[PDB]
Write a protein that binds this ligand. Sequence first.
Ligand SMILES: Cc1cn([C@H]2C[C@H](OP(=O)(O)O)[C@@H](COP(=O)(O)O)O2)c(=O)[nH]c1=O
Ligand SMILES: [Ca+2]
Length: 129
Amino acid sequence: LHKEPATLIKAIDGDTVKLMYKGQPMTFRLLLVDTPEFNEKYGPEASAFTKKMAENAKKIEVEFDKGQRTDKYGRGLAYSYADGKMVNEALVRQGLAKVAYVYKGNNTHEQLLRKAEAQAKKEKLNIWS
Ligand SMILES: Cc1cn([C@H]2C[C@H](OP(=O)(O)O)[C@@H](COP(=O)(O)O)O2)c(=O)[nH]c1=O
Ligand SMILES: [Ca+2]
């Protein structure tokens, strides 16, 4: 997989962000995770976590997997990095997302994320509390 440039347009919620990619605005949905919706428990904390990580970053990058790059709603499907740190992994590591939506052929980082989830669950963090 390859990291490609993007710039932040706007935080949306814990697992979706609006980025400019190849010079076009697009909403990205983060691969392999599910955050609570804003109206659900930990939703506001997940949204805040992603917003801070994206807004504080000097450099945002997106990394597509091997499979589908767009979902049925036209959202890009990627892993996103803020100053080299994977946002997807970070959310899971903090217990603010579950590993989810693991589809064959877009699952390169599944084991990395499941290891983070196991650590969050051992620490009883947030959704695992
Ligand atoms: C993360 C991800 C979500 N989706 C679709 C499945 C879900 O469809 P439904 O909307 O029919 O439930 C939806 C969940 O996204 P959200 O968790 O953003 O709501 O996005 C994909 O198709 N591929 C993916 O990799
Ligand atoms: Ca969600």
